[PDB]
Amino acid sequence: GEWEEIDIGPFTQNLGKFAVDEANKRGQYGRLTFNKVIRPCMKKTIYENEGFREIKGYEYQLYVIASDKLFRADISEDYKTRRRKLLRFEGPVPPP
Secondary structure: OOEEEEOOOHHHHHHHHHHHHHHHHHOOOOOOOEEEEEEEEEEEEEEOOOOOOOEEEEEEEEEEEEOOEEEEEEEEEEOOOOOEEEEEEEOOOOOO
């Protein structure tokens, strides 16, 4: 379950949009307008069992610019359902 860098193409942009959507709902970072996810985007695989290949889900770490501010978002994604949760959202953060 090590971190792996992934691209910042549409899938990743949409992860950033999910994070900003969720941050907007939480109301702790004001009203944010998603702009883009920038590199690096990191993904880790969560396994169902230590020592087994069955994937439980993923965690992503994204740097997302919203309303001209850079945030770092952590998102979980369930393997089976693809259900996502914003785990953490902080910023503005230093440029990565």
